[PDB]
């Protein structure tokens, strides 16, 4: 259950607290192209990093996460 955003793969998790988005990264923390969206969805054993203002090692991460949350309303 991953979608494409800014050429990145994002998933969503929730509970009784809130909905958080997480991005799929390779073992170097480089996000995985949308050109591999099919394998990621079939073989879902990938590194995932939750959206967080404090995570700094992915450029434009805050913008891609905002987009992901937006796309849950303005589809
Ligand atoms: Cl790698
Ligand atoms: Cl940003
Ligand atoms: Cl930037």
UniProtKB/Swiss-Prot annotation:
Known post-translational modifications? Contains two intramolecular disulfide bonds. They are created by the viral disulfide bond formation pathway, a poxvirus-specific pathway that operates on the cytoplasmic side of the MV membranes.
Task: Give the subcellular location.
Answer: Virion membrane
Q: What is its main location?
A: virion
GO BP annotations listed: membrane fusion involved in viral entry into host cell; symbiont entry into host cell
Source taxon at top rank = Viruses
* Keywords (A to Z) from UniProt: Disulfide bond, Fusion of virus membrane with host membrane, Membrane, Signal-anchor, Transmembrane, Transmembrane helix, Viral envelope protein, Viral penetration into host cytoplasm, Virion, Virus entry into host cell
Q: Which residues lie on this side of the membrane: Virion surface?
A: 1-75
Cited function = Envelope protein part of the entry-fusion complex responsible for the virus membrane fusion with host cell membrane during virus entry.
Similarity field: Belongs to the chordopoxvirinae A21 family.
Assembly information from the UniProt record: Envelope protein part of a stable entry-fusion complex (EFC) which is at least composed of proteins A16, A21, A28, G3, G9, H2, J5, and L5. Formation of the viral membrane is necessary for the assembly of the complex.
Listed name of the protein: Virion membrane protein A21
Q: Whose protein is this, by species? A: Vaccinia virus (strain Ankara)
The organism that produces this protein has a lineage beginning with: Viruses, Varidnaviria, Bamfordvirae, Nucleocytoviricota, Pokkesviricetes
Shown portion of the complete protein runs from 42 to 116 of 117
